[model samples]
Target: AEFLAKISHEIRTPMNGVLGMTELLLGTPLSAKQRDYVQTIHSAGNELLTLINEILDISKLESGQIELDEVQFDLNALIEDCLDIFRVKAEQQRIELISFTQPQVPRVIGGDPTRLRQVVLSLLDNAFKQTEEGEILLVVALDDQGETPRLRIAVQDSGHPFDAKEREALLTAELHSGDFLSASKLGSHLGLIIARQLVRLMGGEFGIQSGSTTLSLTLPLDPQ
Candidate 1:
């Protein structure tokens, strides 16, 4: 993970120049073909940047470099704000982004709001990537397993037929995280990997469920 972080930083260091120049070139456009080429360069650079950031995020999670900042913040607002950012993307695909929070769940909670947002965004991104047509639903509720008021957030979508390996992965992958790497036959998704680790670091559980796909996150309602 440390190596990954170092390499990703090196990777991003170069792209920052490439991307900055591309952005500048984009403003002073030329012929249509030139414009298209520059736009592609810009878009590809952005993707590369995202890829590197994901790598760094996973690296930090793996090495326990990220520290949680617990504070009382509105979980619902955080969830909605995150979901809203995907609005335009979902609209482009003509698929709905549905979000629901249980009324009884705490309006304000003590936890790392930023990390929690990262987990939600990660799970939601996974759902969006998988689902091209159907709605992506995010549900927030309470885990019914124990006396403690545990919060549960789930991302669901009608993506594709369940795969055998990932199916088993959904069942047995450790909460702290692992071999789920093989489960991503769709591709190497470092975000979900990072998400699980972040959730674990934040004292939560992250898991996947079949039926298109659903990623679940469970954490203590009042975290220390």
Candidate 2:
């Protein structure tokens, strides 16, 4: 935890220069190729910042220090905001990341919109990172699971397929066991772990499917 904090602080201090200077350069008259290179550097630095924040968030959650602020908001709007943040990155890689809803999804829900968006963003980031081509669809709907009304928000990606063996391996992957942090490596198992914690914190369930090229994480929403 200390290592991650120190690294994050140190890297972010320098990242300001990289991203700030790139933004400034982007406004100047420059060749298309030069702009592209600047944009690439800016984007890579942002991704690095994301990874660091994810590590820090997970650490906080594990230590039971992550707090939540519950409020009512439009579920669809929140999802749209999350998609907007990643849509450009998806476009850059020719990966179509989109969101859809069932016909009857409620306009509003009671929950922590920020944390909910974080979970969705984490899942989408995982999808975008792993997927080279093909579309990643995020859907929200109401599912009646026998006893309770559950709002189901899922992110599905078309990338590497995960068989039963691979699923088992991921499910049993060492988490916070001092094994290694590579489990948190981009496009790896730790993304789901972080998503699950966020979901549970918001009083929702989290799950994954690994048989096909689709990887999904579902969170339940409280009805308005």
Please give, for residues 1-224, the per-residue lDDT of candidate 1 as tens digits: 55655565576778888988988997784788899899899998888687567656656666667656678898888988998889867657558888788887877888888778888888888777777677778999987678777889998857674676755554343422234234456443666655666677676677676752677889876533
Candidate 1 Cα outliers beyond 4 Å, as residue runs = 6-9, 27-29, 89-94, 170-188
lDDT of 1 at 109: 84
RMSD of each: 3.9, 4.8
- Best of the candidates, lDDT: 1
Model 2, global lDDT: 0.66
What's the TM for model 1?
A: 0.79
In model 1, where is the ten-residue run with the lowest total lDDT? Answer: 172-181
* Cα lDDT, model 1, residue 130: 77
Quote each prediction's TM-score. Answer: 0.79, 0.67
